[PDB]
Symmetry: D2
Subunit: 313 residues, 4 copies
């Protein structure tokens, strides 16, 4: 049972979708990711969501030593909840058993747990960006035209066990209705321990879109398959749907995720200068609606997390 | 008129295995006989997979397809809808599975609209004894096989279908795949009017709630346009007749068959594909409608004719 | 969940005699049609009274008494008495409710809000009427509220309890489900509730699949799936499609000449039984079966045929 | 698709004077609050009249005349005049409509069905009233129909047209959207239509996100996306979240002490402007801005401030 006026704001710092040449404010190096996470926390993000990128050229990497560095350095400066991706790399065809290695290495409090195999395509960005600092960038974007983001039921069974072994909470990423169905199945099969934490992700080419209809239907599907008393949820709107759909989520009693991982913009046609800028905006809206951002320790109590110092970094 | 319903019958598929029902058609001759029976019962279109004649194992073998399609056409003017999905749950990619279309040049063929989990390993808790070793191996392997249909695959497939004058039947198992369909349509790969099929109840896809069906259809109206497509629905298993009837109430078309359910009623095996067709036709008729003849299927879906297929 | 309650609504107050020679008008016609409906598989029949002389709707509790007495002599069917009939003539709940103490039925209708309820467009479809009352009645629905205020509802809730009569809570709109939830949460309506969704009335919600799903979802969300069961009425040509929909969704269904005069497009239904026979064929194709009257009593927790006051 | 019409409903007929010292009740109070709302970014203000001495709701056209004249002297704000006010005292449309011929406003409310409209539960929250009329009024609404029959609406449509006043079509339920669809198709209502969805009245549709979306979808499906525009009213604590939802969905929004006495839970709004300022802040965070009164006129096709009869 949680307070009806406290909203968890998550800030997704860099991701794997956007590339350096798309915005000079996309955090690329590990130290940039660290500083932007700490700034996001100080702006009201009770949780930060972390991917690694190669410092030399910003290319996505699964390297757990880069994760280890980033997470340790954030923890030195902040009590923010550090949520680690196990999805990062998937758009480069990297399997779950390799993506998942960050969980036993770092034993984070919470990490992402993607709930189905899907197309996950950003090749259309090649129409929008013509020149790139690095050769890897347009190659990466093109290759997503034929790469499956793979998360089979066999993968998910093994992942559920890995999370339990390292006392890591799954944040169950759902990009379509079928993936909520997948979530219900794994829950009812005993693999996922309640209360579940779901995140609804809207606007991926290969997933569900960004209509108000889509958001409502996702949440109602979770209510009816899983049961309201058995889960909490957050939402991501891609790109310019970040603030409108995030606001919808809050109105519906959900939590919200913002961050340069999901959108490079602060307004129509205006690049966000930092993660903190989007966090400050969403906090202003949360407060107009008579709510407030959760502190990191509130996030821990709300999601039942193990504690900032019970991690392996 | 809004009083004609296309009733499609999916004869064997690739999900059910022989040991699950002695009435699942296995051999090429069984599949032919059953298709022709389904047609005579009011299925204006039949949907065909191939199986290894020896043991029923799904196969892409084009020469089995050719034999089956040739033999159906010799007995019936039924519209023959060929799979390019069969083999997908064994990890065979679109490039291989699509070769039936340039070979046979069918009037219509299936065209799966996204990559997904497609899992039937739970069937192992229901069936313990199998005539063939391949059957439980296959069920188990689906726990870890992606039914792969990437945007690259789909661009290639769109061209293959156009090059052979084969209409795509766009199989959508989830809301995301209707979004994928809208993308491919707007990009210019898929020619309108589109033919969609909503498939409910696959582990890895959307479920079988009335909510699910309505939302799929509303998503197509909203992204594609109510005028720019027609649609059919498949309800897996015991949801076959109720969801098929729902589709009819909603102005859609319906698909039945042993590919999709082994049963005629809770606990009772269907003895043929024709039995399920006869039932659905009775339901259609009580709702004031009638099944489409094959030639009405051709008119409604803009198909080339049986004279122009390569069998 | 393989039993469906099929109700047959025998005559109502909306259709008038000159619209169809098959609409039951006299008390004896209504009785006989109710009995045939029951024999066709309707476990419950729904009754309105009409004037024997010209078929004008009437609330006369003594006409109700004759009709219900005579049905019960011939059949164990559950007899559902209207407390809505007369409402489209401007007659308020206080008068319409008098049937409940008079007859103490097992179940009676209980309408869940005030609304416009207009059938004046029927004057565009029928230009010749045997009786002067028919077109005057139709025209006056243009300016008559079907009145069921919260005061009315509170009084009615008590009247039903005093007579051990189960409410069948008639909802014609989403607002009326909200009213139901209110009356339930306030303590006036004893669960489990029986609701009926009425689709197609001008002044009410329409006949889209969307409308039906949204009504049922609204009740699930406000009242709770565990706290109610439901039936559906589709008006006119929507009778069979929406009824079939309701069965697919796990609801019960109501048919009858009260709700539609037709058996198919352009063809008058020759009797209530014709409609029940057809809905029963559909129910059976969907692997279900009609509830017998005693199954209806068990499902809805009804007091039994011997405990009524007729 | 970046301009949002923010309407402020200054006083209404639901809340009573003793519920908040900040509810405007005298004519001059109403004028002053209307101007402050306009200055805060309300391009339109919605006006009811109240008795100058006891604050009771009143239809008196000469009170409306003074109020609207005095507002227009100070502000070019668009003045929306109620034809619903008095309905909860049982006053019928024919009487409530007289303000339209008298004042020929640019825009006026046009309520789209008969309904329960009950505020007796306010007696649980407010125990002391300065006037006897206040608790009496609230209790009586338990048993008063808010009457708006099809005959009424036919008459009202001619009145609006005769005075070159745009109908703002108030829908409190799904059936009322169906009613709007009918009156449109019958030729009574001139497109493009202006609808307003009212959420939270006891007797109407509630305040769920589901309710809002289903109202808007029904209007799209029945009337056509291109044939209407819409505004939304969330009652009470739902004012801001539902108004924000409306903005997200492309709709316009109404605030004001008519609909909520509060600026935040447990904190009384000290003025209409306080609610307007808040909504306007929310609009701007969502990358939009409030309409000026002249933009309201252009967006809705209003005749202009110089063409009213005050
Ligand atoms: Zn991520
Ligand atoms: Zn198939
Ligand atoms: Zn009745
Ligand atoms: Zn008002």
């Amino acid at each position: 049972m949680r307070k009806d006026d406290v909203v968890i704001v998550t800030c997704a710092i860099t991701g794997a979708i956007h590339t350096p040449s798309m915005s000079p404010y996309l955090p690329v190096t590990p130290d940039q990711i660290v500083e932007e996470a700490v700034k996001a926390a100080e702006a009201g993000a009770g949780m930060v969501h972390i991917h690694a990128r190669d410092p030399k050229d910003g290319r996505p990497t699964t390297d757990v030593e880069v994760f280890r560095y980033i997470c340790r350095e954030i923890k030195k400066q902040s009590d923010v909840v550090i949520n680690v991706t196990t999805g990062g790399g998937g758009t480069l065809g990297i399997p779950v058993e390799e993506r998942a290695k960050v969980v036993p290495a770092l034993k984070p409090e919470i990490a992402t747990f993607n709930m189905g195999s899907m197309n996950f395509a950003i090749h259309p960005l090649l129409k929008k960006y013509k020149e790139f600092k690095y050769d890897w960038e347009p190659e990466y974007l093109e290759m997503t035209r034929d790469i499956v983001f793979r998360n089979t039921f066999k993968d998910l069974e093994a992942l559920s066990r890995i999370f339990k072994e390292n006392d890591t909470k799954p944040e169950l990423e759902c990009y379509d209705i079928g993936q909520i169905y997948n979530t219900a199945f794994m829950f009812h099969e005993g693999y996922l321990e309640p209360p579940l934490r779901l995140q609804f992700i809207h606007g991926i080419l290969g997933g569900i879109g960004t209509a108000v209809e889509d958001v409502l239907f996702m949440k109602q599907t979770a209510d009816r398959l899983i049961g309201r008393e058995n889960y909490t949820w957050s939402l991501v709107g891609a790109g310019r749907f970040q603030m409108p759909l995030g606001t919808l989520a809050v109105i519906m009693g959900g939590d919200v995720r913002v961050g340069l991982e999901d959108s490079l913009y602060i307004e129509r046609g205006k690049l966000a200068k930092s993660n903190a800028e989007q966090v400050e905006k969403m906090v202003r809206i949360v407060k107009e609606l008579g709510k407030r951002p959760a502190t990191p320790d509130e996030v821990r109590e709300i999601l039942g997390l193990k504690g900032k110092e019970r991690v392996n970094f």
